[PDB]
Design a protein around this ligand. Structure first.
Ligand code: 74Y
Ligand code: NAG
Length: 334
């Protein structure tokens, strides 16, 4: 009970944050997203039909090349906001930040081109709780806890603002003072079972337009953007003077710096984003369009309807996830 370990992450375009894990003997390496929003481990399978082009372009786990593989074969379907993967369960040795665990994971055999052709990562490591794990499969962090090796039931996320240096960092068993500053502000979860906290308002400038009588915020490391309801985001965007495109909201690039602050009232404290934190300032041209790092995402019950605080939020606020105390700490990221 005195190990602290880290996972190094790559920052792809401020949208995709992924580290590397090994599966099997000998270790087969996968680029994976560490996602507090979900709880299952999955990578693409060698058994994925090659007619799924995502499987042509990603790394595949070949169970036939692993001596430590253990068959299960129960069919599982993982439905996410942005797409669905389908496959079957397997068991093998997974290596993550020097730590080695016997993990049950999904070998994905069905992997749709949209969106996974757009993924720089191969698979997902769910950092959430057992209660949301499809098939009641013990999640990887629970397994690492069960070894009594870590200093505490705590993991922490750092996402870099710069997309050639350290792209991001996960500390298993603690946090890293090199990447945050000031004090942590701790906020208790609504319930155990989901990394979700009470939000008491959303402000544009200093007018609380949204969540006037409270709402939900899912602290979501696998999400790129900040998200709310279609109707919630529609009200927010009307206020920013943003134009709706098919998959995002844009603003004429010149208007970008002039955009107001957006605040999130969490645990008594007001968490502010400046336009610099939520606009992709690719230009300053009045002719060019610039995209925002906030979009509509409708999560179904009983998680939803909820807000999701993804990479946009985490970049500014170093996040500690506390399993021991069922709470989330935020600190100013550096
Ligand atoms: C192209 C693409 C497709 C999906 C996601 C995504 O939302 N997840 C990964 C896939 C399973 C669903 C849970 C989350 C994504 N985001 C990457 C990312 C990494 C860190 C922050 O955002 N990118
Ligand atoms: C798959 O795992 C479940 C749950 O542990 C178990 O009951 C079942 O026997 C396994 N099936 C096979 C074919 O190994």
């Amino acid at each position: 009970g005195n190990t602290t370990s880290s996972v190094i992450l790559t920052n792809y375009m401020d949208t995709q944050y992924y580290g590397e894990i090994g599966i099997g003997t000998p270790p087969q390496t996968f680029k994976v997203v560490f996602d507090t929003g979900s709880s299952n481990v999955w990578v693409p399978s060698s058994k994925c039909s090659r007619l799924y082009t995502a499987c042509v372009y990603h790394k595949l786990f070949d169970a036939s090349d692993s001596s430590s593989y253990k068959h299960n074969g129960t069919e599982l379907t993982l439905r996410y906001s942005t797409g669905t993967v389908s496959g079957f369960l397997s068991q093998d040795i997974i290596t993550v930040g020097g730590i080695t665990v016997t993990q049950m994971f999904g070998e994905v055999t069905e992997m749709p081109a949209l969106p996974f052709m757009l993924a720089e990562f191969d698979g997902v490591v769910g950092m959430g709780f057992i209660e949301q794990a499809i098939g009641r499969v013990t999640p990887i962090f629970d397994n690492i806890i069960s070894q009594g090796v870590l200093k505490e039931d705590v993991f922490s996320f750092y996402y870099n603002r710069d997309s050639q240096s350290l792209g991001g960092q996960i500390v298993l068993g603690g946090s890293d003072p090199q990447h945050y500053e000031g004090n942590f502000h701790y906020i208790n979860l609504i319930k155990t079972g989901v990394w979700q906290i009470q939000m008491k308002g959303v402000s544009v400038g200093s007018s609380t337009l949204l969540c006037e009588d409270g709402c939900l915020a899912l602290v979501d490391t696998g999400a790129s953007y900040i998200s709310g309801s279609t109707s919630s985001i529609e009200k927010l965007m009307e206020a920013l003077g943003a134009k709706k495109r098919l998959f995002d909201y844009v603003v004429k690039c010149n208007e970008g710096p002039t955009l107001p602050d957006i605040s999130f009232h969490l645990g008594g404290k007001e968490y502010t984003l400046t336009s610099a934190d939520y606009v992709f300032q690719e230009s300053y041209s009045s002719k060019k369009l610039c995209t925002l790092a906030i979009h509509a995402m409708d999560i179904p019950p009983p998680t939803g309807p909820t807000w999701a605080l993804g990479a946009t939020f985490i970049r500014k606020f170093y996040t500690e996830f506390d399993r021991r105390n069922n709470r989330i700490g935020f600190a100013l990221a550096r």
